Amino acid sequence: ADREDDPNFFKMVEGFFDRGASIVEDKLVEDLKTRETEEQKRNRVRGILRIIKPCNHVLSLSFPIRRDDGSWEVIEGYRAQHSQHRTPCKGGIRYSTDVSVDEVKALASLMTYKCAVVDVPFGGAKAGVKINPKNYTDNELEKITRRFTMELAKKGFIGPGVDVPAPDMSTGEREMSWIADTYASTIGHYDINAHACVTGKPISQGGIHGRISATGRGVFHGIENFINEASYMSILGMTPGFGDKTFAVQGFGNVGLHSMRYLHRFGAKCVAVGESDGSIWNPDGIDPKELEDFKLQHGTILGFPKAKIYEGSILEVDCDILIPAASEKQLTKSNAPRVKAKIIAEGANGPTTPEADKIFLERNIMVIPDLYLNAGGVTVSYFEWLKNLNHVSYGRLTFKYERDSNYHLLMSVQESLERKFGKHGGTIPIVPTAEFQDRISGASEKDIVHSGLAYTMERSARQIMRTAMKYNLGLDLRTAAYVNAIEKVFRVYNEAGVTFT
Amino acid sequence: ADREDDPNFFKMVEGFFDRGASIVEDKLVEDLKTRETEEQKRNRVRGILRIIKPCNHVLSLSFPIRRDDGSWEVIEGYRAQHSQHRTPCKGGIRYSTDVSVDEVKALASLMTYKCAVVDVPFGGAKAGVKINPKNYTDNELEKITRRFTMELAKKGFIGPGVDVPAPDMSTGEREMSWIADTYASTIGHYDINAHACVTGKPISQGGIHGRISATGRGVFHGIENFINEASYMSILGMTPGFGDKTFAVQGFGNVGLHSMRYLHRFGAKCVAVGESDGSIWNPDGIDPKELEDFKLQHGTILGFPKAKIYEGSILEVDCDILIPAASEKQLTKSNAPRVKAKIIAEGANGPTTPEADKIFLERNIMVIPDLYLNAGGVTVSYFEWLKNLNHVSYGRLTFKYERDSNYHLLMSVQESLERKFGKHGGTIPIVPTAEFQDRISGASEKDIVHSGLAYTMERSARQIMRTAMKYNLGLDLRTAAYVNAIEKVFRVYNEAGVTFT
Amino acid sequence: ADREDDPNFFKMVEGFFDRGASIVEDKLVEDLKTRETEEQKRNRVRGILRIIKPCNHVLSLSFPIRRDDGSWEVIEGYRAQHSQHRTPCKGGIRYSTDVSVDEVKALASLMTYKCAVVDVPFGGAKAGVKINPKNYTDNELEKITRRFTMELAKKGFIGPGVDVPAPDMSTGEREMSWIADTYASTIGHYDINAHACVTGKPISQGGIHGRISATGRGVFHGIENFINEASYMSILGMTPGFGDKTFAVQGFGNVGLHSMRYLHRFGAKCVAVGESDGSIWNPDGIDPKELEDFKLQHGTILGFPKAKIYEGSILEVDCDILIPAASEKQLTKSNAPRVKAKIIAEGANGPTTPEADKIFLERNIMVIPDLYLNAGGVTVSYFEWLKNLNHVSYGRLTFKYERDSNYHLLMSVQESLERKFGKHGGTIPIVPTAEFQDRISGASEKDIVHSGLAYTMERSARQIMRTAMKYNLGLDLRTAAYVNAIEKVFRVYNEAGVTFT
Numbered sequence A, B, C: 001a002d003r004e005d006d007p008n009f010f011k012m013v014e015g016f017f018d019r020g021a022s023i024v025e026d027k028l029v030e031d032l033k034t035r036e037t038e039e040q041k042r043n044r045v046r047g048i049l050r051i052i053k054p055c056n057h058v059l060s061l062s063f064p065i066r067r068d069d070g071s072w073e074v075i076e077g078y079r080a081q082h083s084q085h086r087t088p089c090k091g092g093i094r095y096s097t098d099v100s101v102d103e104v105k106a107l108a109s110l111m112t113y114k115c116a117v118v119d120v121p122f123g124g125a126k127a128g129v130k131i132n133p134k135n136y137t138d139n140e141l142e143k144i145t146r147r148f149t150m151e152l153a154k155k156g157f158i159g160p161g162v163d164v165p166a167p168d169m170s171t172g173e174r175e176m177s178w179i180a181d182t183y184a185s186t187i188g189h190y191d192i193n194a195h196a197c198v199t200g201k202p203i204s205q206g207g208i209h210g211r212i213s214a215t216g217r218g219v220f221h222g223i224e225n226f227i228n229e230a231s232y233m234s235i236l237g238m239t240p241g242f243g244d245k246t247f248a249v250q251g252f253g254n255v256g257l258h259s260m261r262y263l264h265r266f267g268a269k270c271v272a273v274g275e276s277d278g279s280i281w282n283p284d285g286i287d288p289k290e291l292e293d294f295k296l297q298h299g300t301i302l303g304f305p306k307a308k309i310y311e312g313s314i315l316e317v318d319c320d321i322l323i324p325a326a327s328e329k330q331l332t333k334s335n336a337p338r339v340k341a342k343i344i345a346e347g348a349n350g351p352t353t354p355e356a357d358k359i360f361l362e363r364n365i366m367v368i369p370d371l372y373l374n375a376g377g378v379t380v381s382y383f384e385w386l387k388n389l390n391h392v393s394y395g396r397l398t399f400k401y402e403r404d405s406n407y408h409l410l411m412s413v414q415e416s417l418e419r420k421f422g423k424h425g426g427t428i429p430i431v432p433t434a435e436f437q438d439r440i441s442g443a444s445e446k447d448i449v450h451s452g453l454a455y456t457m458e459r460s461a462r463q464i465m466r467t468a469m470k471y472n473l474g475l476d477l478r479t480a481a482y483v484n485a486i487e488k489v490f491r492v493y494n495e496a497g498v499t500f501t
């Protein structure tokens, strides 16, 4: 944590909101066309916004466990539900000591708008267990997450139609596998959609393919849709395309390692990798496989053979693209000036504070907002949820049909050409290309996740790019997204009677 | 609020706990008799205590209402569940702007031990809606409490087997009548015990006789069982009995008005009555029926014809018995020295801070602790709960039997005496006394509440007086009660496996 | 039942398991990637296998039915749930006097692996009512199955998210229609997915097209994918293709009649048909839609005009392909030597005992295992289940789109060719082939069942073939399938924490 700029997390995000609030508030009053045409439209709007910003529910949990050494410990744990204009709430579970109600109240709110950015029909939620996960044995962490699932389940803070958790900092597949099992074996025993209570699940437990990457893949597509618009690259003095760029990732978690993998593939070059014990560096480039294989073996990126051990801030490392994939409030009033880089891809949730945005705005540094960029996490989870509901491995019912159907479709173009060019213009093979033989049978689960994600990272980027053009926000993409979010979330409340009254 | 001594409410009550924790800690290790005789007994005790102290659950609510003037307002609202060693949780709903999570986390904990004092089998809960209730119209207050019931019901913070609210500051019958009706008409629709979700209900709604008084009646019984022990009255330099005492009540609510009524009856004089706008005074005595009739008509005690307004603190009024029936943290390090008086009957929840107890201890001033004294509220509610479970007006099935049975019992003593004293002994009428003609048919609902309350304000004062003798606490009755509470609450956790693990 | 080889049914199938257990045990330890790398990877593999083998749950039912003649009779009835690594359990209901807990414990286990073979996400279950169904009137059989549904429903052994029965020996559509109706009208009254509690339902009740055939269709696909692989036909000394083969089916039920129909169509020629009263024979060929018309009219295949009555065991009939579609344990140590045939297509559940496999292995006789071959039953049921969850007749929402879309797609190939070949080159009709006019609108429910089944009988055969090659099992396809099943079922347990603990 910084101190010069360590603003309250929930209020910080409220700040981002209140800015989007004003910028559409005119439009919201404008298409509202009710009888009560006045500034009653405005106060009907300025009331519904006041209903949105604050969280609907927060549950606080002091629950015991008996540690491995026979002793008793009390665990603090929180789950804020921000909005519910879409049931079920969505949002991850975070294991840290930083965990605090305001931090979960903040992340939850982010999930509300984040889902509104990428048109996932979930209300925002989040949750923290206030533990250093390093300091508990795996059996302790199991007994902790299972118990946390119970106490959440009993008070209505996890359920396929109510609230669907997912992984986050220091939680992943394993934790999610437990959360399902408890709910499936206990309270959700008769629930057919029981295993749809939580995403990020291991594939064998009902998870969806590519969800672990997913968030990092979406990070790729988010940087892409912008870095391949010279209209913005003209404003950063950079060339369109990944081919020649250099980047740096703070954090090497599920968002870091996979944001590094998907860029080091589709073009650019990793220069430096951070972690909560220090960074490594190499301008020549760092291979993600080698580094990952070194973090698996030795549990730290430090001491990488093919990269020095950068003294200094990772956020300041000279590069093109800075990807904070760590915790929040990392770029602040004080270090934001020194960031030497040109594109900020917020992988992590709110890693940049509003005072860093004002600097980055001035310094013509493009911050790709947290709302849009890591929405790949929720999007693929949103798929993992529908998979759990449709109870089929996607593609299965149809494969040998849009296959045979296409081979017959092709055989029509063929017979029709032969049937005009005689036994005596030849035989005309109509045959799938190489990059159609791989789609000849249609959508597999692998593919849907990719294209389903690819589509809405692209679509929702233009939805931002219009709005940044429209209201003339330029490189203030953060305000552009919250404008879109505030509008979509409002549409629900407006056409609803707003409350059971 | 004071500012020399305005300690954190939850931590304040934790303070009272930690004191009781140490004093029995030895005994708890003592009767524990496990295989693992050590100071694992002590750490197995000190762990279970660490599980008790902190609340199990807190739910935080920002829910909208439409005010009367068509506008939207967001309402903040909290319900901490302290313990659950007894389901269902019990505890009131408070309407104030003082409402804060720490204040509800504090009161909830008090309800846990309060129920343990008077052997009510409920875990402690409480709840606040953070509104000034006077600033909302009755229609607003209705759709505020109804909505608050919903959001509590949905997240599992109200239910006959889960959590049973009750009235408190600025809530009473009317609110409770709403809380039932929503739950009964909505979520608890099929629940046979639906109307058992909340106590303090109007009699016509399933309430129990004398519940509104109840808390103030129990306040009478509590002062009584002590003021009629010269062993304590020798230590205060005061005479046993109510007949000659004078008393002052801060606050004129459900706890004030009825603590005043039940003492001005069974003996002593009212000298002064406080309220959040000032106090009235009259050493000659103040009649509760006249005052109440003046507060009903004019909505304030100020300007009472037969009592001027008192210049100065109501708590400092010269008198025998000080009854704070207001909000908490009223007697503090700074005004506790000046308190004229000799018996402090804490009607309100925690109206005295731990530093005031230090002074009162020194100054030989007997503070009758909040745990024991206002437990009449929960006790009669506990009856109101059983009534809604037994679905019978108490006494109904038996009246004309323990009636006819007694008249036949009497007719046996008679015939048997005649059957020995022949003719020439006369006829010997055996006839109920006047007081026994009123009980000839047995327990009515009125009576059970009285004696059922009377019993356990007695049986539990005993249990405190035993323990203040035992561990030699003298006039530290507050520590005496927490000693009983901590022991009873522990007795559950110990014989339980402590957690599903 | 045989005498020399009548092994315990559950232990028999355990035998098939334990064989597959050892063969992958090495691999399972191999890809296990834990840092407890020892031969304690082996013992936690050996533990997880020990958890798989035995059934999780068996429910035993003595329930009364009143017969038609006013009298009372008690009905014995069992439902073992083998595994639950996939909810909901799947598996049929069998009406026989052979029914015994061991026999249901056995079939249930088979359903677990059977679903793992063909990647249906269900745990294995089965159920028997211990009645001779011919000895009860249809109104008796109705009140029997309805009552059996209740007692199963109440104890949690039937439910769309819990356990989904289906037909089996002496049960079919009619019984399944009842099972739905009771649970739809009673316990599942509010359940939206109520009618998804049971498959095999009549089409009008929520059933899926072709489910009655389905199992026999899949029997066709199974024999096919092998008999069209000369790599195995070289090993049996037989020619690839159906065109010239002769087969014999023991049993003429849902599995027999439709295994006969789908082969007598797509090539080969029925030689003999068994039933529980004797067989018929005709080397010239037997038409299924004469023999069925004779069984419908006369309730027996015996005395078929165009086929004499056969003089000995149906299993011993000289032919190419032996299809046991009867009860289990039919080919044993004693008659397995004299089976005069080259391909054994286990339609029935476990019709061949492990000692018969030992002979068939030696005698180079290919047994197509029960796991793989009749998995068409569960597969189409698995479709019937998803249909009742998706609440739409498949294909409906899209028909007139992938139709118009294709006609527009074709119109693009056309206009683009015309756009290049001018008025000079003519008009170039692009027109669907005959085959493709029947798919022009896309997947109907009929088609999905076919291709959806066709695919996975074809995707899962070529998971067996490329495990029989891998671990060199040759014509031991039964061990090859259990190797796949044990692996897929393992994977869930491994990545799960394995139990609530």
Ligand SMILES: NC(=O)C1=CN([C@@H]2O[C@H](COP(=O)(O)OP(=O)(O)OC[C@H]3O[C@@H](n4cnc5c(N)ncnc54)[C@H](O)[C@@H]3O)[C@@H](O)[C@H]2O)C=CC1
Pocket (backbone or CB within 6 Å): A167, A168, A169, A170, A171, A215, A250, A251, A252, A253, A254, A255, A256, A274, A275, A276, A277, A325, A326, A327, A328, A330, A347, A348, A349, A350, A374, A375, A376, A377, A378
């Ligand atoms: N798992 C998922 O699907 C999603 C995660 N996110 C966000 O990504 C961010 C974190 O990524 P995770 O997925 O939880 O992976 P993670 O929890 O495994 O990442 C943390 C790793 O990076 C290091 N690290 C943590 N904080 C650091 C800091 N301030 N400075 C330097 N190094 C630090 C730590 O040593 C740790 O090893 C969060 O903001 C999270 O909300 C959002 C999209 C999806």
Ligand SMILES: NC(=O)C1=CN([C@@H]2O[C@H](COP(=O)(O)OP(=O)(O)OC[C@H]3O[C@@H](n4cnc5c(N)ncnc54)[C@H](O)[C@@H]3O)[C@@H](O)[C@H]2O)C=CC1
Pocket (backbone or CB within 6 Å): A195, A203, A204, A205, A206, A207, A387, A388, A389, A390, A391, A392, A393, A394, A445, C084, C085, C086, C087, C088, C115, C116, C118, C119, C120, C121, C122, C488, C489, C491, C492
């Ligand atoms: N206990 C449960 O019911 C859980 C829910 N599911 C549901 O399964 C449905 C269908 O797709 P998936 O089964 O996930 O297969 P999948 O093809 O999507 O991939 C899952 C992995 O497990 C393998 N697998 C296939 N059948 C399996 C079986 N019966 N048991 C264990 N592993 C099997 C697959 O070959 C694959 O390697 C999903 O819609 C999901 O909702 C799957 C996991 C656990």
Ligand SMILES: NC(=O)C1=CN([C@@H]2O[C@H](COP(=O)(O)OP(=O)(O)OC[C@H]3O[C@@H](n4cnc5c(N)ncnc54)[C@H](O)[C@@H]3O)[C@@H](O)[C@H]2O)C=CC1
Pocket (backbone or CB within 6 Å): B167, B168, B169, B170, B171, B212, B215, B250, B251, B252, B253, B254, B255, B256, B274, B275, B276, B277, B325, B326, B327, B328, B347, B348, B349, B374, B375, B376, B377, B378
């Ligand atoms: N209603 C019940 O059955 C139970 C309530 N209590 C406690 O009694 C106390 C309050 O009385 P209630 O009947 O609950 O509600 P109430 O609102 O009817 O009574 C409170 C009275 O005291 C006045 N007041 C509030 N704060 C004051 C302050 N700082 N200074 C001077 N006057 C103030 C208020 O104007 C009001 O007249 C609280 O501690 C409450 O939690 C405890 C036992 C049972």
Ligand SMILES: NC(=O)C1=CN([C@@H]2O[C@H](COP(=O)(O)OP(=O)(O)OC[C@H]3O[C@@H](n4cnc5c(N)ncnc54)[C@H](O)[C@@H]3O)[C@@H](O)[C@H]2O)C=CC1
Pocket (backbone or CB within 6 Å): B195, B203, B204, B205, B206, B387, B388, B389, B390, B391, B392, B393, B394, B445
């Ligand atoms: N809507 C409601 O009022 C609900 C209340 N209940 C149960 O009602 C039960 C009966 O208690 P009570 O008989 O009221 O106490 P009670 O002790 O006062 O019964 C005798 C007197 O109460 C009056 N009374 C009795 N039943 C009444 C009724 N249904 N409506 C209006 N006045 C009535 C009569 O004037 C009678 O003289 C309670 O025990 C409660 O469990 C449960 C469901 C709904």
Ligand SMILES: NC(=O)C1=CN([C@@H]2O[C@H](COP(=O)(O)OP(=O)(O)OC[C@H]3O[C@@H](n4cnc5c(N)ncnc54)[C@H](O)[C@@H]3O)[C@@H](O)[C@H]2O)C=CC1
Pocket (backbone or CB within 6 Å): C092, C166, C167, C168, C169, C170, C171, C215, C250, C251, C252, C253, C254, C255, C256, C274, C275, C276, C277, C325, C326, C327, C328, C347, C348, C349, C374, C375, C376, C377, C378
């Ligand atoms: N309907 C389904 O879903 C599928 C059924 N199976 C299995 O196929 C076998 C046949 O059952 P279904 O076709 O389903 O219904 P079914 O009950 O109508 O078929 C039974 C046929 O076999 C005859 N039969 C009984 N015992 C015999 C014996 N010792 N010798 C010769 N014939 C005998 C019966 O009289 C009748 O001809 C069963 O073992 C079943 O487990 C396997 C998977 C799918």
Ligand SMILES: NC(=O)C1=CN([C@@H]2O[C@H](COP(=O)(O)OP(=O)(O)OC[C@H]3O[C@@H](n4cnc5c(N)ncnc54)[C@H](O)[C@@H]3O)[C@@H](O)[C@H]2O)C=CC1
Pocket (backbone or CB within 6 Å): C195, C203, C204, C205, C206, C207, C387, C388, C389, C390, C391, C392, C393, C394
């Ligand atoms: N009753 C159930 O089983 C529940 C499941 N669903 C699902 O909704 C869909 C129902 O469509 P289907 O009627 O099965 O397909 P469909 O309309 O193509 O007709 C198929 C069969 O249903 C009957 N049928 C034809 N038209 C009908 C009509 N307008 N209304 C009622 N029956 C008609 C005929 O017997 C025909 O053989 C299915 O997917 C079903 O699984 C929906 C609600 C409850």
Ligand SMILES: Nc1nc2c(ncn2[C@@H]2O[C@H](COP(=O)(O)OP(=O)(O)OP(=O)(O)O)[C@@H](O)[C@H]2O)c(=O)[nH]1
Pocket (backbone or CB within 6 Å): A209, A210, A211, A212, A213, A214, A289, A292, A446
């Ligand atoms: N730890 C780690 N995970 C990987 C690595 N490569 C891929 N993954 C993840 O592992 C899963 C299996 O990946 P693949 O079988 O290669 O399939 P894919 O669709 O090509 O996946 P991607 O190339 O990652 O988009 C994917 O969901 C990836 O997210 C790697 O090198 N290390």
Ligand SMILES: Nc1nc2c(ncn2[C@@H]2O[C@H](COP(=O)(O)OP(=O)(O)OP(=O)(O)O)[C@@H](O)[C@H]2O)c(=O)[nH]1
Pocket (backbone or CB within 6 Å): B210, B213, B261, B289, B446
């Ligand atoms: N608010 C209020 N209620 C009263 C008062 N007096 C009586 N009641 C109610 O009417 C019932 C009959 O009163 P009483 O005849 O005096 O008998 P009681 O129950 O011993 O009186 P209390 O305990 O003082 O209420 C009581 O149980 C009370 O519920 C009063 O002065 N004020």
Ligand SMILES: Nc1nc2c(ncn2[C@@H]2O[C@H](COP(=O)(O)OP(=O)(O)OP(=O)(O)O)[C@@H](O)[C@H]2O)c(=O)[nH]1
Pocket (backbone or CB within 6 Å): C209, C210, C211, C212, C213, C261, C289, C292, C446
């Ligand atoms: N019992 C019986 N059912 C038949 C027979 N022929 C057709 N069917 C029914 O028809 C269904 C499917 O038939 P079709 O719609 O004609 O499909 P198809 O491609 O023309 O050929 P099939 O599926 O073999 O009949 C089967 O599931 C049976 O229910 C028959 O000879 N006997």
Ligand SMILES: N[C@@H](CCC(=O)O)C(=O)O
Pocket (backbone or CB within 6 Å): A090, A091, A092, A093, A111, A114, A164, A165, A166, A167, A168, A199, A349, A374, A375, A377, A378, A379, A381, A382
């Ligand atoms: N925790 C991730 C993923 C949320 C989810 O997939 O539900 C996020 O906040 O974006």
Ligand SMILES: N[C@@H](CCC(=O)O)C(=O)O
Pocket (backbone or CB within 6 Å): B090, B091, B092, B093, B111, B114, B164, B165, B166, B167, B168, B199, B349, B374, B375, B377, B378, B379, B381, B382
């Ligand atoms: N609010 C009162 C009454 C609670 C109840 O009766 O449940 C108290 O805290 O004692």
Ligand SMILES: N[C@@H](CCC(=O)O)C(=O)O
Pocket (backbone or CB within 6 Å): C090, C091, C092, C093, C111, C114, C164, C165, C166, C167, C168, C199, C349, C374, C375, C377, C378, C379, C381, C382
């Ligand atoms: N009874 C059949 C069908 C099971 C099902 O479709 O559920 C079998 O065991 O394969």
